[PDB]
UniProtKB/Swiss-Prot annotation, chain B:
The lineage of its organism: Eukaryota, Metazoa, Chordata, Craniata, Vertebrata. It comes from the Eukaryota. Changing R106N: Does not affect subcellular location but displays a reduced affinity for acetylated LDL (AcLDL). It comes from Homo sapiens (Human). The chain holds residues 143 to 270 of 273 of the full protein. Changing C30S: Abolishes sorting into the cell surface and binding to acetylated LDL (AcLDL) while increasing N-glycosylation. This is Oxidized low-density lipoprotein receptor 1. Receptor that mediates the recognition, internalization and degradation of oxidatively modified low density lipoprotein (oxLDL) by vascular endothelial cells. OxLDL is a marker of atherosclerosis that induces vascular endothelial cell activation and dysfunction, resulting in pro-inflammatory responses, pro-oxidative conditions and apoptosis. (Microbial infection) May serve as a receptor for adhesin A variant 3 (nadA) of N.meningitidis. It is found in: Cell membrane; Membrane raft; Secreted. The cytoplasmic region is required for subcellular sorting on the cell surface. Expressed at high level in endothelial cells and vascular-rich organs such as placenta, lung, liver and brain, aortic intima, bone marrow, spinal cord and substantia nigra. Also expressed at the surface of dendritic cells. Widely expressed at intermediate and low level.
Length: 130, 128
C-alpha cells in the first residue's frame, strides 16, 4: 500500500499517531527520526480526517503549529502560516511561555498550551505514489 | 473507521484481497465480509484505486460483469457503468460459459472469462 504499516493514508500523505506522549520538542524529534514531521493541516479535508481518525479519544495530540508568544503569528514547522478559517485556536493564547506556545487537538478542538507540557502527537510524511 | 487490513477512503472501506480466485468465489468472499466487489462511481474512485495499487502488476476483480456481449456491463447492484470513466479492454467480444467479468491491472480495466483467477477489491460503508 501507499503507506508503511501502522501509518494511515490520506490524500498524498501518511499519518502516524504516536505511541508515546512527550513535550512538543521531543515529539517533533520523534517524527524527524521517522523521516516525518508533525501534523500540518492545510485544509478542512485534513481537519475532518484528523477529527474522524482520533474519533472519541480524549487524549491531546500535538500538531506542528507553534509560536514564540502572542506577538508572533501561528506558523507550521516549515514557517508557512496557518491558513485562515480552518480552525480556531482555543486555550492559553494570551500568555507567554519560555519554551513558547504549541498547538494540539483534543476532543476535536484545537488548543494552545505551554510547549513543555506532554501529549501524544501525529506525524506525517509523503505517501509512496507513482 | 474501518476494520483491520481495510483502507479508509471517503465514506467507504476497501479491501485488497489476500486470495486470488474466480469472480463468483471472489464475489462470495466479499459477501462473507458483509461487503461487495468494487464499484467505481467516479473518476475520483478510479484515481483512488489506481493510486492504491499504482506499482502492482496483479489483476484485481471489480463488481462489473455481463453474461455476454449482447448485454451491457453492469455493477453487481444492476446499475450501469457511468460514461467516460474507463474503457473496458481485453476479451469483450467472445462468449464464455460463466460470463465475462472485469478486473483492473496496471491502472487499466480489462474483461476476461469469469472462471479465471485474480485478486479482488471489496468495499463497504465506513463506521463514521
Amino acid at each position: 500500500m501507499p503507506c508503511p504499516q501502522d501509518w494511515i493514508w490520506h490524500g498524498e500523505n501518511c499519518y502516524l499517531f504516536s505511541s508515546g506522549s512527550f513535550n512538543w520538542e521531543k515529539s517533533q524529534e520523534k517524527c524527524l527520526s521517522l523521516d516525518a514531521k508533525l501534523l500540518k493541516i492545510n485544509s478542512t479535508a485534513d481537519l475532518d480526517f484528523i477529527q474522524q481518525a482520533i474519533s472519541y479519544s480524549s487524549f491531546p495530540f500535538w500538531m506542528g503549529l507553534s509560536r514564540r508568544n502572542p506577538s508572533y503569528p501561528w506558523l507550521w514547522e516549515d514557517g508557512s502560516p496557518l491558513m485562515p478559517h480552518l480552525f480556531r485556536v482555543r486555550g492559553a493564547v494570551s500568555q507567554t511561555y519560555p519554551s513558547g506556545t504549541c498547538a494540539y487537538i483534543q476532543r476535536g478542538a484545537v488548543y494552545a498550551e505551554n510547549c513543555i507540557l506532554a501529549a501524544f502527537s501525529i506525524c506525517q510524511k509523503k505517501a509512496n505514489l507513482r
